A paper describes a structure:
Moreover, a V18 structure solved at an unprecedented 2.0 Å resolution was obtained by improving the crystal quality through seeding with a graphene-PEG nucleant. The PEG chains of the nucleant are thought to attract the complex to the flat and porous graphene surface, creating a localised supersaturated environment favouring protein aggregation. Moreover, we see >1000 individually imaged water molecules including those in the inner and outer co-ordination spheres of the two pairs of functionally distinct magnesium ions, and at a pair of K+ sites discovered here in ParC. In our topo IV-DNA structures, the Mg2+ chelated delafloxacin molecules are bound in a highly unusual conformation in which strikingly the 6-amino-3,5-difluoro-2-pyridinyl substituent at N-1 is tilted 51.2o out-of-plane of the aromatic bicyclic quinolone core. The bulky C-8 chlorine is also out-of-plane by 6.8o and interacts with the face of the adjacent tilted 2-pyridinyl ring at N-1. In this regard, the 2.0 Å delafloxacin complex is highly informative as all six positions in the coordination sphere of the active site Mg2+ ions are clearly resolved. Two of the six inner coordination sites are occupied directly by sidechain carboxyl oxygens from [name] D508 and D506. A third carboxyl oxygen from [name] D433 is linked to the Mg2+ through a clearly visible inner sphere water. The remaining three inner coordination positions are occupied by three water molecules, one of which links to the non-scissile phosphodiester group joining nucleotides at -2 and -1, with a second water potentially bridging to the more distant phosphotyrosyl formed by the catalytic ParC Y118.
Delafloxacin is a potent anionic fluoroquinolone approved for the treatment of respiratory infections that acts by trapping the DNA cleavage complexes of bacterial topoisomerase IV and gyrase. Fluoroquinolones stabilise this complex which cellular processes convert into a lethal lesion, likely a frank double-stranded DNA break.
Author numbering:
A (entry chain A), B (entry chain B): 411 to 648, 1001 to 1486
The structure:
Amino acid sequence: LLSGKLTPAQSKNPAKNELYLVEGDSAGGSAKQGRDRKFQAILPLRGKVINTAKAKMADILKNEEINTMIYTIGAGVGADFSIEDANYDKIIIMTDADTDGAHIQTLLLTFFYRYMRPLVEAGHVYIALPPLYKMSKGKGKKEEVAYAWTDGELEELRKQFGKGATLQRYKGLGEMNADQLWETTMNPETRTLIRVTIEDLARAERRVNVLMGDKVEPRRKWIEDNVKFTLEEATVFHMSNIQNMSLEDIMGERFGRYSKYIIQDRALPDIRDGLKPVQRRILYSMNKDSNTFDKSYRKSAKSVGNIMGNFHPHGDSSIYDAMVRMSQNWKNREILVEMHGNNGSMDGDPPAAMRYTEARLSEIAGYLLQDIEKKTVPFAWNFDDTEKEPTVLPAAFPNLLVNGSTGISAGYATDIPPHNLAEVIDAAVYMIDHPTAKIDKLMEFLPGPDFPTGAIIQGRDEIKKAYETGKGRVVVRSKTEIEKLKGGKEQIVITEIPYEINKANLVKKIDDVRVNNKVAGIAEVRDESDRDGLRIAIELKKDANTELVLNYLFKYTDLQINYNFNMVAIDNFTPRQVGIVPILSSYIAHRREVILARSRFDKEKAEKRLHIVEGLIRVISILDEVIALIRASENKADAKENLKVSYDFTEEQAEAIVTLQLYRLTNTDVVVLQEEEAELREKIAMLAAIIGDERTMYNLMKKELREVKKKFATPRLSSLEDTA
Amino acid sequence: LLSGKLTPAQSKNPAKNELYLVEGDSAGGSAKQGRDRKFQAILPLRGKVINTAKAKMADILKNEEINTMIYTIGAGVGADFSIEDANYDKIIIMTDADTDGAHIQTLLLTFFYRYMRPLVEAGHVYIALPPLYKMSKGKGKKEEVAYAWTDGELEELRKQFGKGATLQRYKGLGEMNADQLWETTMNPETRTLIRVTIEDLARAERRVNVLMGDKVEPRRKWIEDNVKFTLEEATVFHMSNIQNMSLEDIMGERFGRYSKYIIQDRALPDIRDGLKPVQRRILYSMNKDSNTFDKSYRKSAKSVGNIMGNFHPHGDSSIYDAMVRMSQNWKNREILVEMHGNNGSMDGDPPAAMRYTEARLSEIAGYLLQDIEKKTVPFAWNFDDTEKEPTVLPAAFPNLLVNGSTGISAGYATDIPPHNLAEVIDAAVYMIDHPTAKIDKLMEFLPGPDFPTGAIIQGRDEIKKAYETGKGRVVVRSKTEIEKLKGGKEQIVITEIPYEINKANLVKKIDDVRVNNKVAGIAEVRDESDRDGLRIAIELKKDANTELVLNYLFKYTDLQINYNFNMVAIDNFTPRQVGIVPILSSYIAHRREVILARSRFDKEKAEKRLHIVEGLIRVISILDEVIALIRASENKADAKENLKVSYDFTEEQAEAIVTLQLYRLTNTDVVVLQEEEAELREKIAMLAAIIGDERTMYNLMKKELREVKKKFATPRLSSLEDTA
DNA sequence: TGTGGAT
DNA sequence: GGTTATCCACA
DNA sequence: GTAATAC
DNA sequence: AACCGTATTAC
Ligand SMILES: Nc1nc(-n2cc(C(=O)O)c(=O)c3cc(F)c(N4CC(O)C4)c(Cl)c32)c(F)cc1F
Ligand SMILES: Nc1nc(-n2cc(C(=O)O)c(=O)c3cc(F)c(N4CC(O)C4)c(Cl)c32)c(F)cc1F
Ligand SMILES: [Cl-]
Ligand SMILES: [Cl-]
Ligand SMILES: [Mg+2]
Ligand SMILES: [Mg+2]
Ligand SMILES: [Mg+2]
Ligand SMILES: [Mg+2]
Ligand SMILES: [Mg+2]
Ligand SMILES: [Mg+2]
């Protein structure tokens, strides 16, 4: 039931037959359609293959996908592996030419290396190579489709005696027709493979264990030593026919590519705006489409489709789940998306699918995007070079700390808990005035996290350690109170639970305590929560020891947990473990760049208008000459030329004069224009002084942070305690 | 496994407890969140409930949803039904306030009427009424939100505290938050219910059997007698508290609403453009978004999400599957969508989901939309009154016959097979010249269907009957050929199969014939089809009788089938069974309206431009005076007034003069404007003649249809034979 | 075991 | 529309 | 026992 | 991403 289904070849022939291991059932379908059914079999992989270096050998051998591979190859598994029983001469791995494709290659290669080594050794395991590019279009009798695998092969194809043709940049196998798949990647005559060889059993064994073994620290080290976070990779001169590569180099190049991508571009937040790329794209796309807080909700499926088609070439379930999370006020301290409909619950009940719900950006989310239209932040080409997207948002509140981040990458993970907006701003403002400020002083403004689920955080020293180093362990404990009853009876009443805990599962875990009588005293467990309030009632038997029961429950259920800070974020393209000081100084440095770039943008605009207004006032004095000149001129371009040469107007002034509508000649009021010149000069002065003076800039930064605080501040929800 | 999961009430209490039967798991989730958990239980319904009047009893008691309803109510079924054992005092049906909601009510009420009648009889079965409208005035005072169920309650709310207020039109329970659901529809204090009463067991029994029984003809008749296809329905008038209604009237109102909707707005094509609403929306939306044949493909999920958000308030799987079908050249003779990726196959393998594929309109589909921008076709408000959509497309080729339609409605179905485009145009052009043309003569141009799957159609007389009446039965038979082998030995080779037949299932069925040895002689069945062509090989045993085998197979497999024509389409809002004559004359009448409206649009545009050009020629002769005049004027309106009074320009001319940009005075070439005057006058004359003379209009209609034919004609694929 | 973006 | 897998780091 | 738009 | 239900008409 759980594995890809094998489409076998029509005829047995272990001399020639090929098993295609295909990334995904949909591309598996295309391969089924495009293949030569006589000798090529198709086994689709349902996403990420089990890591056979990490998992246990019972567990590996109860994995459906692995079993159906061992069945099909018909040769046992290593120890019992008879290459002379093998049903194929080639096992051909065919994935997307993308980073998750690279990962899948890695995982499969570790299975073959670890349990079918003769197969690898004999050079029977191959890879793929789909094209990255398709060029050209000239109708039916076509003369205008070729394919390319490198930028250099692409440059070659651009030279075609034609003009501009069409270029497709392939994102995956799922954009290719079965004809195209066969021609480019499955036909022995025309495909390009990589034969995987072992050049050195010792260097291979090392490289596979470091990349794919249980131990993080060597993999982290390998990544620090090998991955170039601030440089692109050069990428191979694509050789045709077959081309050998060592298991060593394939594993290193593939896992390097994947690692770098999921570190920088998936699971870890940017230190400045606090966003993962998917979250930033959600916000930018919704904002670009005017799906803001002040306008009506818009069908989720529409938002998600625009996000996917314009910015984020990944599954809609990934996009939609991230958008839903941004709407849930038990996950985010300051929700960034407002969602009508079933956006889930603290019981973890499934949110309605995107066909049902509708959404827009929250008001505070607009503050993440404030001044994105004023060239405040670096943009980059989207995935297919049709549109630009921000690499970071202006971020007028410090979202990294306010909403936190929880992610799992390669060689790194991150847990940054949420914080109270007012308190974070208070620390930031202090640090604007005192750049060398120390943790003890900062903690007067920012004493600890502020979970949206409230509860009690215990461990002042551990907060401090986390704020210093990025790592610490604190206790988070449910808010409880005792309530008397009839019968000489008490009940424990829970009104706030720990962050990230599922209420329904907690209730079940507590009820199992009672059922198994692990501790004595429990009469009944009732969830009495409703739409207005969380309320769990643990009703105790007559003369139960309520302290014994409550302490048992703190210890052995998630009624209390440990929260481990592991504060990692992307800073200068590279993952970095950070305390509060780097977090806040990065934010400040970011706001500095934003305010300066905004001020330049606005000043340029005001100067252009000023120069135009000066030109219009001058035009009055020479109106008859200007009209005559324009009438004499051959066209618009010529008229402007004559204005500059004859009368010393700038380009911008000349463009403005020649595009005036005739009816504007009714107005000869220079006084209103002079008033505007003066207003513009005042503004330019203020903007120039912000650019020319660090302290003027910093004082504007504080004024704006204080405004955000005043508008969005809410009371702290979690209480802080020192020890137990 | 297959049923909605019950969320029970906390405390048993048959006096007060309520079972909510909720349309869909997602709204079931919202109901779970919004309820009062003490007495309200939630049983979600997974879509359409089994029709307990139609289906067997084997099937009814094998149905998971029905069984879990019987279980939960706790009162046996039918014969053994004890109302004093019932676990709820109220069974409350809560659906979307939409047509499929109405259908679900209908199906449930038939179950309770037939197998829990005492429950209905005692007035314990109710229907929750969700609001249609929410009215709001944004952030502020308090947020300010009231609800409405009728247009009259809506009109009231417009006054109330409304003016600069936003109105949400609810499309489903899926757009409501759990607190909104409780306030409006689940709280006993504030909800409005309908108690379902039996006023008359005899009238009820009849009304349930006609609407829900397996006999179509009475239902068809009931629909003809009761449903008003060309009138709106009256508003309910919504009373407070509970309000009783007879099972008779409920069933009639609800099933009438459903019937009309799926007849007019779902399963049946419009006779003019040949489209179902979902298909027309796919085309209009993709065309509006510039997703045409000449431009880059676009991610399917983007198209689909725009279609859903702007036009088609239904599931993405419905939309995407319809788009995919429009792309499959074994379903459509002239594909309307071009789709890259896995768009399925003749084996029925699942198309890739919308996250993988990308799409655009085909070139010929552009001809369905030609001149949509020239006020050629009636538009109507979309589902939420934000955007207009066409009720029918201009349709520059007769798509109803060319691409056909297969559909299943209420009381009616449709099968219209595909046809060859050139042939259909030939018939249409003949009929333009010979309005009273008869079937025998039309069939010289249009001899029969042309399936995109080819094969052999047999039964000339039955084609003629179908072309006369809309109904007939023809044989469709696979194209076959014999091939010799070494061993002397023969094989039957199939290269074309019947329309709508799955190849893989046919192959399997033939192989079962071999295995069961129903006819002597079959050695092996092999599908040897590949990307370049269909080829199924039936290898016979030495000295098998080819003809005996082939005859067995035609008779007892789908290697040959009957195609039953049942040509139903919507004509003047009403379903109608139609032969070729009404189909073609409707088309012609449609193109007449289009060409006339286009000609009026273009003529009006030319006349406006002509008047402007006349004024611009006059301006040039008095340009100095005009510029001086404008300079003497106080403002735009004064300048125009001075132009009218001093020089007799019209309003339109004056507005055009005074909004000229100064650079436009570089071009005062009166001869070029005179040339333009002449060209415009010639065009107006041509356009006027089309409007003033039917034959001029019909000649243009034929010229255009012949151009389409010349561009898009392809040879016949199906062969026709006279005897079956 | 479970967190959250991915296949 | 629920259900069912995997990866990755870190308790 | 399957077709195609719906839940 | 496969797999699994139902309505509706008509063979
Ligand atoms: N849970 C619910 N599902 C459906 N529903 C919708 C489907 C779709 O939109 O494409 C679909 O393909 C589908 C397949 C099914 F097999 C199916 N049934 C299997 C049984 O468990 C349910 C159901 Cl019901 C299905 C619904 F429309 C509403 C629902 F709440
Ligand atoms: N067939 C394939 N599916 C996945 N895949 C994608 C999911 C998603 O996009 O949200 C998902 O939620 C999901 C759940 C699963 F339980 C699941 N497995 C159950 C086993 O049968 C497979 C798989 Cl694998 C899943 C894939 F990414 C690629 C696929 F080909
Ligand atoms: Cl101006
Ligand atoms: Cl003009
Ligand atoms: Mg991919
Ligand atoms: Mg998923
Ligand atoms: Mg604990
Ligand atoms: Mg609905
Ligand atoms: Mg479906
Ligand atoms: Mg037959």
